[PDB]
Amino acid sequence: DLQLLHQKVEEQAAKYKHRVPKKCCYDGARENKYETCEQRVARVTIGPHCIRAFNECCTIADKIRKNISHKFAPXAR
């Protein structure tokens, strides 16, 4: 893991009652060098729960990537 990135995303994904929002969580967690979470979620249209899960996991993952950047650490965590 990098800074619990996979642990924290998988923790959130395990909370979802249905497969669509779970998948949208994983989609949100994918890194995108060009767009922030708010820009990306604006393009999601499956439905309300997908939107919320996408944004929740995008926020979790990008906060952790921000922490990783802030730490300036070589290698794994």
Q: Which residue has the tokens 């944004």?
A: 55
Q: How far apart are CA 77 and CA 75, in angstroms?
A: 7
- Can you give the CATH number for the domain in which 58 is found? 1.20.91.20
Q: How far apart are CA 29 and CA 40, in angstroms?
A: 11
Question: What's the structural domain count of the chain?
Answer: 1
Q: How far apart are CA 28 and CA 36, in angstroms?
A: 10
Range of the domain at 77: 1-77
70 alpha carbon, distance to own chain's centre:
18
What is the 8-class DSSP label of residue 43?
Answer: T
